């Protein structure tokens, strides 16, 4: 449960996605989320009526070659968003950099 949220760009999971992955009924999928937050492994708020768990905190956990690469990719993608914008702004208001 903690693993899935962390590796996805989004910080929300459907309960149907939890149902498959931990192989549990839909009753216990909800209880698993409650228990996790009580443990303080994940933090957020629970929608039972959009059937989402929306996370704001992940507890720091192991690093592994696998995980090292997963975080690297996200930074390149976000690096692209920064880089191209600053060029939009440079081309704009050219007369004024004083």
């Amino acid at each position: 449960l903690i693993e899935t949220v962390f590796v996805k760009n989004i910080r929300m999971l459907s309960f149907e996605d939890i149902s498959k992955a931990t192989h549990l009924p839909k009753d216990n999928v909800e209880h698993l989320v409650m228990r996790a937050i009580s443990l303080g492994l994940l933090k957020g708020s629970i929608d039972q009526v959009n059937e989402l768990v929306t996370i704001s905190w992940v507890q720091p956990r192991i690093i592994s070659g696998d995980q090292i690469t997963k975080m690297k990719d996200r930074l390149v993608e976000w690096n692209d968003q920064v880089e191209k914008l600053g060029k939009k702004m440079e081309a704009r208001g050219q007369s004024i950099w004083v």
Binding site: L85, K88, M89, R92, G93, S95, I96
Partner: protein, 266 residues
Amino acid sequence: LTKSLSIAFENGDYAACEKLLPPIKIELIKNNLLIPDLSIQNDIYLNDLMITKRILEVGALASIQTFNFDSFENYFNQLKPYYFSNNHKLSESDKKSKLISLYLLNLLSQNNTTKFHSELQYLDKHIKNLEDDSLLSYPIKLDRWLMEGSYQKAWDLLQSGSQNISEFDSFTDILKSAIRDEIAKNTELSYDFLPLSNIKALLFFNNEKETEKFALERNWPIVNSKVYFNNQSKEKADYEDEMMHEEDQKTNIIEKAMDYAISIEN
């Protein structure tokens, strides 16, 4: 050549008229020089003027009927100076009323209403109460019924002009093709589902097969006998996003403030 075009028109042959016309174009240069081109108009340049109107008049009516709309607009444009001026002295005739009626349909069947209404002024000055509307009412009624949006009144006016197989009918079928396209532009917003019997009804088909055939050509996805306008809307929106307009089409949050900033420092 010159008098030969007249009687070829009269017989009912219009493939004959166009064949023979490129020879007479050379002699149309000769005729044009005889008149001063309407700087003053004698009864001698009146005699000349009739020769000049005659070649072009019979050429232009014939063009329609061989389905050379392109050639029709050329001949008609040539009449215009004689039509403009010297009214009530060999400028206005029965053929003129017929010829302008047909042209107004040309502009309308091309679907330029910019041009059609600007051409209508020019005619305001000429005949519309000096030879009243009796054949020119036809294109004007039609344009109005689609502006209010009534395609019922419009199809009827076309269908009863189809009774009259003359040359007015050659623009009527174009105009029935046009009513279909307009509706097919509208239906995207109007609905999301129509059964196939319902699509047929709006598009003025009497055959359910014929409806399916237009849909291929008009790119409507009918799946299990029901249409999906939401898909079509997407494709056309996608094309409009693709083209370079796009920073200030959307207008970026950042872009707004950058404008403000340099103005106060300039």
